[PDB]
């Protein structure tokens, strides 16, 4: 993008701030040539004073009056430089902050406004990484590097034109060589922009990997994939590291080339242009050479910033200006009144944008009557959810048209249309907030009476009146801190609160027991009179009350100490730090050495020109290598340090226990932005900042050494001032840390909000609350704005104070030197001491690196607190009992457990069941009785408070976690997947070693998956999408079963393994699962009692304790709770 398109979000006030700050930066830049002029005048008057002393009109001119005059001039320029520096830094920072805030708001608005298929083709980790890092880089490009670049540019141009205005026919060569510098700068800018593009692509890939791995923590722990994920992260880390070192190399070459050219150019100029000049003119010429070279060399980080900003803004602008095909927030359309509910299909044909080669809907024709219940039935993959989504205008038909009461869906207002549809998805998804808030997302004006009535109708009221925080308990993120049936009932309430006209049910009772199913069916039967209900069913029991049934057959419808820690951590990069330190030490020493040698050389017949030219060429020659060395070494050290930080952080994050991830302050959004941003913040201080610091320190040290080498009374007076500089630096660091302390909480919260919004676009679109999430993001973003406007003042004032106290020190030195001259050859001593102290004037800019220092401090502190934690269940711990012959005998003895997130609610009350090896147990009961909790305890995701579980006579709390986990096969209530092929998803079962193709094929065959995957254009290579969301839920359950089976585990865990695949007209998957459970210990929990018919032992669990136990015949004969559960349906 164009460099001046980065300001496309500016308003009039922003333009005013930029103009005023730029004027102040121009004055600050021209401050230094005034210093050159006064030094030249002082030299002239010094020689004019000592000529008459050499002699002995004359006697009329003294020294003290002019010395006080010079001191007053240095006081005036110091006041001016303080004012101008403060204004420039402050104003540029405000302008940048306002622009960045506006662009972030616009980016999120445009992303939310997009259509569903675009989200199918784009990963949420990509967008999160962009929103976190690329806009930050854009901000870094235009914040204050812009002002510093302007100041250095005006200082260099004025140092050049000093020779033109004062002096003549000596600056003929800078005009000759400037275009070469221009082309060099342009080419290096293009190169580093390309390298930046590659670097951000690599970091975006790494961000996607981290997001998926962190959001799939239970699965990645169950199947032991930590090593695979750390390697997967490290690959992208290595790629980005290579691009970063290339950037450092090219930049270091640019800086060294600039220095060497400049010095070589002026050496040749002094060689030939000599063929009149007072010594003061020579003095100011030599020092103008240095000011030009130094500021030109120091401008390079600004060029880095601008090119990185353009490269980063490319993709952000491309996303921001895209026009979506289907706009959920557009006004255009029609809003009819008095809808009846008749919806028809007309020869509809559809293919997903992700798989365009598959015809999923093929010439469909169905009619849905008003005020009736119509049930859709068919096998898995028959395109029922596709029609369900096409009704909502999630997509558009390729051919054909679906009408609502005789009107094309495309011709109606999308907001009004979607505000009349009540949807329950196959897997209800809740947002991390209270229960009443989650239910109220259906209708914002819903009162507490409305919420409680919706909960009562949804058969959810009792289980939330049995909670400690009734209606105010946090459901957790994604509703994870909830049971499946409870989550489903909350979703039913959220759907029914709106009182919709088109009520839509996608397996509305999948995770419900028969009693709650009966209650919900009674409510639906009461409601059925008015609204038109469309529900997909797999069982005839719910079909009993449906008026018409439509069958789907493959797309056709037929009716009926952080600093010390960092220093120790960065030990491996010691040689690069050593070489960079040596190079920057030489670079610091060369300047005062030049001042001394030049001042010596001046005080013109023989060999003086040869000496001058030889010195110039030697300095250019040395400076090229040393500047290159400094830049390259420090860039390499920073890159390696950040790579190691990211790798170790991801490893430590993966090594934590499941209760740590259940913390409400440990969300994947927060952890992802933490991992993405802490390393970058540390980089911003561990890069070339250290090289600049050591360069400046070596400069000041050498300058003071050779100042004290001549007269100690003036050098002491000069050294008297530096405590003020140290105090200013410390104060800035203190306030910066104070602000960053809460800046990081604000950043984590905005990251959590944006990830929760992006990851569940389908749910947010279904309920239609697009505005609420954008408003919440803006509200959470408004918090750091005040902090930013407050830190701008601190930064500007500290920078200005340092630069001002330097000139104060110079004026005081002039006054005291005048006193020493008048009171007590001292003119020569003062000349050389002033020369070196002026050559040592620009080293005090140690406040450019300070604003990043506090960020690095806080980030490193938090990183080490995360790194040094000891989990209660350490999966990286190699200590624990192991026995060679495993048998899979499991028994609970008086197991009790309470969730750490809900300490006032005990879930398990003395669980005690036993299983002999080779037997299966069926856990039956109501929803939320702790059935999945026992499985979590078995998988050592948690540990019982009192009581214990024994595996083959070994207490579970002393057996190795990896060893135990290798012997278990688990399927979850809501299985999850990774965004890769079906093949790799199956291969994930055994992560220790590769498994042959034959085993995968066999597992797929026994999982009833081979035919469907054979039907795909890519057989076993098709991408499944993020979380495996680009498949119907039946095939997700089937791939989960295949992945569990492929391990051949001694313990097999089945949690509602037939929830989605429920077509019971054929006895095939039942035989498949029976053969799977053959010959091994299995625990199978299922709310449908026909599939657990043949279990050896059936345990009925109520309120965390087992109340019945036996086989099917004894439990049936006892007429207990099992008889009522069976006979109720
Ligand atoms: N986003 C997507 N990208 C590609 N293919 C998809 C996507 N969503 C669904 N499909 C495919 O569409 C077909 C039917 O999906 P759909 O979810 O409508 O089936 P279904 O009859 O509702 O199944 P189930 O009974 O398992 O819920 C399947 O082949 C599935 O893989
Ligand atoms: N991570 C969690 N943190 C806190 N409470 C939880 C958590 N997971 C579940 N619960 C609660 O513990 C109780 C039992 O949960 P569990 O998931 O074990 O039930 P379940 O018997 O398997 O139910 P269902 O048949 O609905 O799946 C419920 O009240 C549920 O809301
Ligand atoms: Mg479905
Ligand atoms: Mg469960």
Descriptive overview:
- The chain is an alpha/beta fold and 1129 residues long.
- The chain has four domains: 3-325 and 574-867, ABC transporter transmembrane region fold; 361-554, P-loop containing nucleotide triphosphate hydrolases (Rossmann fold), CATH 3.40.50.300; 887-966 and 1096-1129, P-loop containing nucleotide triphosphate hydrolases (Rossmann fold, 3-Layer(aba) Sandwich), CATH 3.40.50.300; 969-1080, P-loop containing nucleotide triphosphate hydrolases (Rossmann fold, 3-Layer(aba) Sandwich).
- The chain contains 40 helices and 23 strands.
- Helix 26 (722-759) runs antiparallel to helix 29.
- The chain is elongated and about 135 Å long.
- The protein starts with 11 loop residues before the first helix and ends with a helix.
- It binds adenosine-5'-triphosphate (2 copies) and magnesium ion (MG) (2 copies).
- Residues 120, 352, 354-355, 360, 378, 380-386, 426, 1030-1035, 1060 line the site of one adenosine-5'-triphosphate.
List keywords for this structure.
protein transport; 1129 residues; 23 strands; elongated; binds magnesium ion; ABC transporter transmembrane region fold; Rossmann fold; binds adenosine-5'-triphosphate; 40 helices; 6-stranded mixed β-sheet; Transport; alpha/beta
What's this, in brief?
This protein is α/β, with parallel strands linked by helices and 1129 residues long.
Amount of beta strand? 5-15%
Query: For the record, what CATH class of the largest domain applies?
Result: Mainly Alpha
* Terminal residue distance: 66 Å
Find the count of extended strands (DSSP E, 2+ residues): 23
**Estimated helix fraction:** 55-70%
Task: Please name the CATH architecture of the largest domain.
Answer: Up-down Bundle
Count of alpha and pi helical runs: 40
Q: Could you give the order of strands across the largest sheet?
A: 7-8-9-4-10-11
Main sheet: strands, sense, barrel: 6 strands, mixed
Query: What's the gyration radius in Å?
Result: 37 Å
Q: Can you list the ligands bound to this structure?
A: adenosine-5'-triphosphate, magnesium ion
* Count of individual domains: 4
CATH homology superfamily of the largest domain: ABC transporter type 1, transmembrane domain
SS-based structural class?
Answer: alpha/beta
GO biological process, one term: canalicular bile acid transport
InterPro entries: AAA+_ATPase, ABC1_TM_dom, ABC1_TM_sf, ABC_transporter-like_ATP-bd, ABC_transporter-like_CS, P-loop_NTPase, Type_1_exporter
Domain ABC transporter: 343-560, 890-1128
Membrane topology: Multi-pass membrane protein
